[PDB]
Amino acid sequence: SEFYKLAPVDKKGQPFPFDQLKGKVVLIVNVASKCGFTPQYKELEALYKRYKDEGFTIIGFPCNQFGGVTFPIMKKIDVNGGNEDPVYKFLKSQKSGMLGLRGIKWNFEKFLVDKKGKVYERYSSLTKPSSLSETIEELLKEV
């Protein structure tokens, strides 16, 4: 899949190749570059702690376009516009509404990815990470 070809820059400025994500369920979340969103990070961390050893991870992308965790955090990117990161170009090509805006609307929009690397679904910023647990569980059980 094109998903495993992706290699965004990580927080330390080093390549983070998505091929290491093979056989894993992945939650991709754009994260707030500014402070004041503690409840959101707590819920994500809880999801990660709960499921990480089932073959699950969360890749958090800092972004400043909408103005304390242990899962992978990447270098700050644009999720929208002419400088949109290739990861977000790919994600939106797999999951966007048929009409209207394809772009990310606000902080903490979420994409859930297959164990085979196929994007399962895109969720809005308002849907709480905990609400995705059951969907994560059925993807983890994939044959």
Helix/strand layout:
Blueprint (H helix, E strand, L loop, with lengths): L24 E8 L5 H14 L4 E8 L22 H9 L15 E4 L5 E5 L9 H8 L3
Parallel strand pairs: 1-2
Antiparallel strand pairs: 1-3, 3-4
List keywords for this structure.
143 residues; alpha+beta; Glutaredoxin; 4 strands; globular; oxidoreductase; Thioredoxin-like fold; Redox-active center
Polypeptide structure, described:
The protein has 143 residues and is an alpha+beta fold. It has a single domain, classed as Glutaredoxin, CATH 3.40.30. It is built from 3 helices and 4 strands. It has a 4-stranded mixed sheet with strand order 2-1-3-4. It comes from Saccharomyces cerevisiae (strain ATCC 204508 / S288c) (Baker's yeast). Its main location: cytoplasm. Interacts with YAP1 and probably YBP1.
Note the gap between the termini.
Answer: 17 Å
What is the CATH superfamily label? Glutaredoxin
Beta content comes to 15-25%
Question: What is the C-level CATH assignment?
Answer: Alpha Beta
PDB class: oxidoreductase
Keywords: Thioredoxin-like fold, Oxidoreductase, Peroxidase, Redox-active center
Assembly: monomeric
Entry title: Crystal structure of glutathione-dependent phospholipid peroxidase Hyr1 from the yeast Saccharomyces cerevisiae
